Design a protein around this ligand. Structure first.
Ligand SMILES: *C(=O)N1C[C@H](NOS(=O)(=O)O)CC[C@H]1C(N)=O
Length: 260
């Protein structure tokens, strides 16, 4: 009950709705708050779409150069906008999507999987019947009340990230490529990483959307311990609401101190 009380008070403090699911791989202990309620996933899909692309493609296909036109570029494409001339491989596109949250990279990953519905199919293959994927960037970030397009739950996202990174669903080389892309990125510095003790390495994928949507999903490696998977999703109640990263950092501290 005590952990539940902290999450209730975070919702009051930040005027927000909060979804939490975390699993300690060593003890199987879990922490859950609104774990089955839907939130817009925003940019967090990019790590799952990248993992699905790695799973389904040979190293040869993943290194082939893709060319895209200036007309495929959507807003917030800091990496892909530089490479109209050289093109990028699916490996490079995956890294751009995960490290920098590049939206055109996200779109190319969704396209490689057969569009949003093909990405959803890839998730059903790993047992996720919850996530609903319908739109491309940047429309997928609208986070409209009552809309289930481009939504998932904290439990489903955490379970998906665990499936790709810790359940031995990718070969060692692809798995380590994926988790390295998740480590050390500025987009994650104020989120789960800000709630993790120093020395507990965090690999994450952040997200942000309308209605104050602010998300982070992560693997955490505590010293001398098995990993922890953590998904923390949040939104607010008016279209223009500004999120506060501290909500995610403070929720992550609750999770990581209690699974300690
Ligand atoms: C992902 O949610 N997005 C991509 C980009 N980076 O934000 S993130 O670091 O929180 O992922 C801008 C916000 C959002 C988007 N598509 O608008």
């Amino acid at each position: 009950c005590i952990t539940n009380k902290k999450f209730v008070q975070l919702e009051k403090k930040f005027d927000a709705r909060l979804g939490v699911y975390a699993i300690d791989i060593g003890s199987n202990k879990t922490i859950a708050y609104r774990p089955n309620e839907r939130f817009a996933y925003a940019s967090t899909y990019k790590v799952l779409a990248a993992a699905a692309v790695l799973k389904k493609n040979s190293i040869e296909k993943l290194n082939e150069v893709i060319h895209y036109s200036k007309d495929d570029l959507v807003t917030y494409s800091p990496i892909t906008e530089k490479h109209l001339d050289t093109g990028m491989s699916l490996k490079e596109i995956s890294e751009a999507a995960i490290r920098y949250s590049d939206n055109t990279a996200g779109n190319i990953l969704l396209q490689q999987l057969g569009g949003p519905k093909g990405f959803e199919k890839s998730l059903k293959q790993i047992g996720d019947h919850v996530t609903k994927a319908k739109r491309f960037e940047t429309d997928l970030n609208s986070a409209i009340p009552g809309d289930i397009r481009d939504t998932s739950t904290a439990k489903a996202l955490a379970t998906d990230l665990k499936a790709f990174t810790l359940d031995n669903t990718l070969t060692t080389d692809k798995r380590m490529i994926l988790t390295d892309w998740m480590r050390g990125n500025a987009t994650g510095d104020e989120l789960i990483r800000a709630g993790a003790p120093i020395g507990w390495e965090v690999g994450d994928k952040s997200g942000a959307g309308s209605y104050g949507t602010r998300n982070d999903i992560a693997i955490v490696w505590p010293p001398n311990r098995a990993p922890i998977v953590v998904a923390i999703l949040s939104n607010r109640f008016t279209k223009d609401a500004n999120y506060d990263n501290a909500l995610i950092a403070e929720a992550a501290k609750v999770v990581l101190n209690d699974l300690k």
